[PDB]
Design a protein around this ligand. Structure first.
Ligand SMILES: *[C@@](O)(c1nc(C(=O)OC)cs1)[C@H](C[C@@H]1CCNC1=O)NC(=O)[C@H](CC(C)C)NC(=O)[C@@H](NC(=O)OCc1ccccc1)C(C)C
Ligand SMILES: *[C@@](O)(c1nc(C(=O)OC)cs1)[C@H](C[C@@H]1CCNC1=O)NC(=O)[C@H](CC(C)C)NC(=O)[C@@H](NC(=O)OCc1ccccc1)C(C)C
Lengths: 306, 306
């Protein structure tokens, strides 16, 4: 028992990280097979960033303008192209440590591990959710661009995120691995801001089940409710609406605990109206929304990768 | 910017994990050079656990009674011994992926990453502190014994923890890699309980500095205090005493922020007396104590490993 925010083991991804330099701009790249993927703004100076014309900046670049290092060894670039906001560099050597992999575009509410990197070297790993306003609450400094987020399924790494920028309030924005931004952000140093964020209700419900499983059940009350009634109160607290899909997804945790989803919704409702009155749940003094139902099941049944 | 609980990249340790079976008991082992280290209770049945005589259980075992698998391949055991509460199995092949490594015994307050494992396979990674009462707040199920905790310094892995047991309230106890328990616990299924835990004051102060660095400074007040005065109030809230060593350790964060340690102590004092009145600090609704000063510096300056 016990319940922790837990990242995937990072080894398979550590093997893919390289440093990419163009002129005096350095950041991280991801090396899979004979392609290196990185944020396109590697081709910019810090003046260029105010308002870059990426097609004009790029067209004046050739293969040899791109320095790719893996450890202390240089990779030879034999081709380049731009897809949306990522640059792809064809190199002459396949990554010998390429894992089985996929590229996916995740939905809001879905979680993933970030391997934060500097100069092609890993610094640490942590878990994030794609927020409803299409940002993530990360930890990123200058040089972290190109760090990636992923999930693992047994031996298969699904890359879902590449890091590009920080927005007001210290939240983060990036792309999928086809270089399409999550959210309506652009890779330019012009004033931009995320919209009001909401709470990922299905995830809060998953975490409450996690609590009951781990024996922390003081908040279970004697009421039930309906989906509509719940949703009315949800809306007022800037919680995302709960759908039939969400109910279905929570089916396994419902079954494991003997608590019907709608009964747990009534307990959450009461927490929203009354607060926690100084108590904690699974050590937290607020309602956590960055564990998916899948995250909870995985951690509560000890699923394993290789 | 942004501040996350962040584990070390796990790849170097993933390469060391094996499965160890004796009879029908399975758990994890750590393979370094030509030795595999694991909890000694691998040699017990679940009846034996109520009150095991480890010397008598062991002496009746030979090398061939120990099954060590790394992937789908069996390691040949050519020697065994017991050191405190760990078993060491000499095998005939050095781990080809052994990192540079050390064994260390950490102090209360120090943090480390856990690679939680089942059947010699990693399931995830998370950050823990050695609590003042010599437990950790982990996430561990049956089969997780032998999972290890570590720190990385550039390329050097310091193993500090091996997981053995869970105690009342869902907290965890284990050994250093010489098999000596943190705390006065024993590897027996007899009623045992940790003492009252306290808050790691120096770590809370580190985290407040992390907050100021990340621009969250609403809690800074206009008072100062003394170490004694602070300690008087600390004691009442079950905070560990602050020492001159602690002040010295916080020197770099003090310098980076321009806030004297004793001024920050006065802000903490006021948080302890008044609470946070519904506000959050770095997204938390309580005072976090599982970031060391070193943890904060590392994350705030992007230090990297390889
Ligand atoms: C990334 O690591 C790198 N960028 C460069 C670069 O641009 O080289 C010339 C090299 S590495 C960083 C990661 C950032 C730094 C701080 N935290 C992070 O996550 N990315 C950027 O520096 C990035 C470049 C974008 C424009 C593609 N710029 C930003 O993140 C900036 N955000 C921004 O310009 O938009 C928001 C905004 C709000 C308010 C006013 C103006 C802009 C921030 C401000 C650094
Ligand atoms: C470890 O993964 C394994 N143990 C065995 C084993 O004993 O084989 C026969 C194989 S793998 C587990 C990890 C535990 C399970 C639940 N969470 C964990 O962290 N360790 C144990 O099962 C362990 C064995 C000890 C005695 C060496 N036993 C315990 O953790 C038990 N704790 C205990 O007996 O002491 C506290 C106590 C409190 C109150 C009453 C009685 C005892 C718990 C109860 C499972």
């Amino acid at each position: 028992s016990g319940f922790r925010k837990m990242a995937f083991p990072s080894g398979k991804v550590e093997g893919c990280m390289v440093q990419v330099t163009c002129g005096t701009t350095t950041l991280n790249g991801l090396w899979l097979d004979d392609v290196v993927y990185c944020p396109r703004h590697v081709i910019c100076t810090s003046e260029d960033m105010l308002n870059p014309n990426y097609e004009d900046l790029l067209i004046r670049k050739s293969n040899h303008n791109f320095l790719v290092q893996a450890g202390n060894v240089q990779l030879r670039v034999i081709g380049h192209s731009m897809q949306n906001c990522v640059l792809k560099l064809k190199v002459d050597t396949a990554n010998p440590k390429t894992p089985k992999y996929k590229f996916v575009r995740i939905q809001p509410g879905q979680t993933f591990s970030v391997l934060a990197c500097y100069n092609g070297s890993p610094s640490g790993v942590y878990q994030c959710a794609m927020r409803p306003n299409f940002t993530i609450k990360g930890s990123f400094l200058n040089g972290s661009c190109g760090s990636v987020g992923f999930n693992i399924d047994y031996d298969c790494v699904s890359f879902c995120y590449m890091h590009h920028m920080e927005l007001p309030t210290g939240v983060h924005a990036g792309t999928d691995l086809e270089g399409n931004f999550y959210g309506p952000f652009v890779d330019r140093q012009t004033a931009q801001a995320a919209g009001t964020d909401t709470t990922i209700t299905v995830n809060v419900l998953a975490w409450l089940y996690a609590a009951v499983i781990n024996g922390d059940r003081w908040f279970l009350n004697r009421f039930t409710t309906t989906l509509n009634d719940f949703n009315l109160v949800a809306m007022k607290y800037n919680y995302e609406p709960l759908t039939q899909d969400h109910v279905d997804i929570l089916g396994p945790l419902s079954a494991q605990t003997g608590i019907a989803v709608l009964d747990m919704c009534a307990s959450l409702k009461e927490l929203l109206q009354n607060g926690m009155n100084g108590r904690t749940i699974l050590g937290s003094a607020l309602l956590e929304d960055e564990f998916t139902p899948f995250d909870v099941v995985r951690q509560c049944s000890g699923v394993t990768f290789q």
